[PDB]
């Protein structure tokens, strides 16, 4: 007999159904930068791992293997067939195409539209309760298509939005106010990007509404130009690739905060992208970020953030815009 | 209509099933123990009590409860009814019956079976599939009666067994070193109690033998007397039951590990108490504590330790005096 | 030739002093459920428990000490001498006198401060560069009483106040809204106790304010009765008395909170008792619960809610009661 | 008067001098594999990264900061200028010179001489009581490189050796047990890379000691090939370069686990590159690794592991090479 049937007695053998399994697709900095957060948080008994080159993928699931002993997440597995996805609660998806020189958007969003034409059937194939939690840019338009092409309802399809755009807002708030970004909100809503909203209204400290005690806030006048923080997310992205060439922990780290409240069924309220249609007067079929109760399945509600008329109009354009490109697509 | 309609909209209705949940049985300063740990380490989306002391199980419930912004388990629930423990993946059992001045061992057990024969078919009704953990006293004898009464197979019911106590073993052996004990490493195996087996063999630290360094080891001739180590073990919660009346804060510890391997499927190896028949001589329903791994179906292995021969034959005798006592029981 | 140095070999022998120590005095249910947090929470590399009960203090920290092997705390002491408690960077002090029955305020509260002229120079000369957190009743009276036995600077000397109080309320917050309580934001300030304020202004969910949403919300026109949910949080330990016999958990969940801010300098905001001359008219050397900024220093900063008229009378009463009293006391 | 000033009242302004501050030096993917999984165990409440690329390394933190509101870690600086790193209680270099074709071992460590000539001695300048941890390849060599050039007692000179070789051997244990790799105990020891030793003798289960069991394990007649698995060892780090281009997370994640050890003072063993003259018959000044004590001095104690008369003499003929190209280093 072999030494592992002489140390170990079997009582039984056939096993399995992961009860927590998380996909991300594409393995990318972000992808991984996910991946690591991920299982340094606990939220998973199994991670998979699946992108197009192959050698890349099973060497990054190699490294993360090396480190088990380290790590409570017992089954990490690879591999460019989806079906190493099969019963993923959650699936992250970050895959996609970079922008070419002078690409309209248009087009852009067309060629990552072919991408998820074969992505997005593969994972509801194999994973057709799960979540999904779309990160490719432009995230809003590419939800919507995530949306389209899976047939799912409209909870369980979610977009990281203005999420990290939000946290951005919060640790440089704290900077100005020397307070941890934990003690700071503020939210920064709608389309991902340029064009996005900050609040200037719930942007307070212990309760305190910071609009009331300085109602120059966020405007012209203001001395302290507090719109430069808002300036300062959108150019937040921009700054760090200049630098180091891409971002990466810190989308990492709120796609794992995000991945942590759906997982647990915390009811947590985070900025991500929802489909909107019915609300703020958009009519269209379209997908912007505003402030969702994430759970066990998805978006099950909506806070109704009361805006102004110049934020109100900020959105309905932002929404035609969207519109505008979607209803150019075709699947 | 209401503040919460104004401030909300509703995507989804509340169709839950929790996907994580524990029920703790018993809400005295073990079963409190075991709740303040299994809510620390964030192994549960819902933890349940459940005990028959009204009074009692409301407040600790709603203190519980309090402290919700400092946890990551959104829904704790009680009740004395068992439909509060509705779809458990882990159940543990603290409950039982306290020996009275001049009982017999039999009659005590027997008291304790008519307790579980209220409490196991409660559990099994709401959760036909779930992990049964017993820490009831006297555990070995304890688990051999949930097991008989909820008619679970050998893998889903698994008594504390000798896990604390080898905890315990390397506490001490890690003092008398000046190692930390996760570095430190020695085993007691068998009978829960005065008649439990150190395996002097596997005591070391980095897999350097202690017996073989100092072959008088665990001996009476052994000048440095580490026999008593093992004594302190046996008679720790005795002298801990002196000084403060009770033990809670270390079972607590080592049930919560426990539950940190079966929730999360790791399959580490713990000292708990399974049934063994067939292993070193034994032909009775007994169940005496060996290393088993521990995962999402219970114990599905189990080490064979070698013992010597006196190491054997403690074991025979536990398993005699065991079965001595559950042939007269009556269910 | 002993073992240990036959498997050990030793580079030097000197050279400790805790780096992150923290006491706790008192090791009833309060202490206790601190402790456990606390070591739960991994925020100490030494803890040390002190309290005039030998016995069961011996007994909490052996208990404490067997569950070493799942913990990262390498040290625990206690000993009914301060000298345990040497260089600790925190000292939470839970100990105190209960009222009986015919006594008055006063004369409960000169009790108090005679328990607190042995503890306060005690812990100052072993630790004098601690901050110290006062958790005993009435908790703004004796964290004056902390403030002027120590001579400490009243940034190193903080009361945990409303911080339970808070906790409470945005739990309650979170049931009636169907949201985590993390997400629900509420400030209860003041006297902790029946005479709290619940700044209705500050009450919010993604920083849309419930007051501005539902202009009744707190007053008595109120059809949804907001009121009593802040009552209901005033009356929360007692309900938990009446059926438990204490309160424990929560409050020691709350207090590793602030420990969490002050080990590890976050700079959190948390709404604990300071002394608050100077502001709303307050004249006298009296503690009260702002929303302050917590590190390593103790309470560095302070927020300035902004409080209606009514809001600014009820701590003018208060803070007129609380002195109304220490002129009274006998140091 | 500012909005922060209208916000905020100030108590104390100076407050410095951290108290637990990791420095990491080198920002490639080793280095900041370390950081990522450092930030993510709450280690430090101070990070600082020092490199010579300045705008990876602005790039770099300025990311790591984006993530604040999900981290622990209040601090997070950078600098080309070693001043930043004043003050750490721990710093882990991880830069060196990449390999060139056709160039020898002595060669390549002379050019990682000439820039430890730099880095060490202005790490002393500004963090003179710090640990030093070093990663940078040759390990065992560049490890001996900083103790000369530090001055620094041999506690508190650590590389970081075999520490994730052993890790990996677990992992492959694990893998072929049935068993995660916390409950499999290994042992790689000695120089770093093809000439390492794995312990037969001390792998077990539970306290089984595998070579009692199988006693051919190891050798050449093994039939079950035991000896692949060191040889996998010995090479994964080689597959995964050829997959993805270098090595990171799992190197990240066991330096954070030494980190853990010193920064709480755990006294855990650990497999480290640590000063051997002295031991195993060596009589020239080389590192070899060993299972060290680690706590907040360093190396306080490490273990004498019973060698076979071939394995001793494996470390010798290691020690042998080490000496020989050490000893024509130019400083
Ligand atoms: C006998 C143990 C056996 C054991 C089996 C199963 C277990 C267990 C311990 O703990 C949890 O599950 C030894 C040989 C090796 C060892 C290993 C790892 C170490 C160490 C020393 O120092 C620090 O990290």
Redesign the interface.
């Known amino acids: 007999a072999?030494?592992?049937d002489?140390?170990?007695?079997?009582?039984?053998?056939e096993?399995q159904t992961?009860?927590?399994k998380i996909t991300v697709v594409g393995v990318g900095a972000v992808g991984?930068?996910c991946a690591?957060?991920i299982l340094?948080?606990?939220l998973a008994?199994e991670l998979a791992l699946v992108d197009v080159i192959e050698?890349?993928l099973?060497?990054?699931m190699?490294?993360?293997?090396?480190?088990?002993?380290?790590?409570?997440?017992?089954k990490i597995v690879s591999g460019k067939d989806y079906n190493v996805t099969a019963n993923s609660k959650l699936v992250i998806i970050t895959a996609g195409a970079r922008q070419q020189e002078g690409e309209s958007r248009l087009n852009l969003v067309q060629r990552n539209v072919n991408i998820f034409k074969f992505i997005i059937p593969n994972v509801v194939k194999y994973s057709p309760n799960c979540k999904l939690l779309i990160v490719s840019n432009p995230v809003d338009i590419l939800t919507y298509v995530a949306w389209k092409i899976s047939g799912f309802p409209?909870?369980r399809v979610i977009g990281s939005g203005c999420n990290?755009d939000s946290?951005?807002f919060?640790?440089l708030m704290?900077e100005?106010?020397?307070?941890?970004?934990?003690?700071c909100?503020?939210?920064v809503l709608g389309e991902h990007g340029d064009s996005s909203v900050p609040?200037w209204?719930?942007?307070?400290?212990?309760?305190?509404?910071?609009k009331?005690?300085?109602p120059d806030?966020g405007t012209d006048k203001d001395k302290?130009q507090?719109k430069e923080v808002h300036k300062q997310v959108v150019e937040?992205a921009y700054?760090?690739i200049?630098?180091?060439?891409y971002?990466?922990?810190?989308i990492?780290?709120?796609v794992?905060?995000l991945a942590?409240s759906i997982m647990?069924?915390?009811?947590?309220?985070h900025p991500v992208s929802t489909m909107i249609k019915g609300?703020y007067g958009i009519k269209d079929d379209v997908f912007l970020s505003v402030?969702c109760?994430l759970g066990?399945?998805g978006?099950?509600?909506?806070?109704?953030?009361?805006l102004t008329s110049e934020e109100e109009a900020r959105l309905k354009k932002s929404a035609d815009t969207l519109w505008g490109i979607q209803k150019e697509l075709q699947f």
Chains 1, 2, 3, 4 share one sequence.
């Open positions: 072999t030494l592992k002489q140390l170990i007695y079997n009582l039984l053998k096993e992961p009860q927590n991984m930068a690591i957060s340094m948080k606990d008994d050698d890349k099973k060497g990054e190699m490294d993360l293997q090396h480190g088990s002993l380290f790590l409570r997440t017992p409209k909870n990290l946290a951005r919060r640790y704290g100005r106010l020397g307070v941890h970004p934990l003690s909100h503020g939210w609040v209204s719930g942007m307070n400290v212990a309760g305190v509404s910071l009331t005690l300085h806030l302290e507090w937040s700054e760090v200049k630098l180091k060439g971002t990466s922990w810190a990492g780290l709120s794992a905060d942590e647990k069924n915390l009811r947590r309220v609300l402030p109760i066990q399945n978006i099950s509600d909506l806070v109704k953030v009361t």
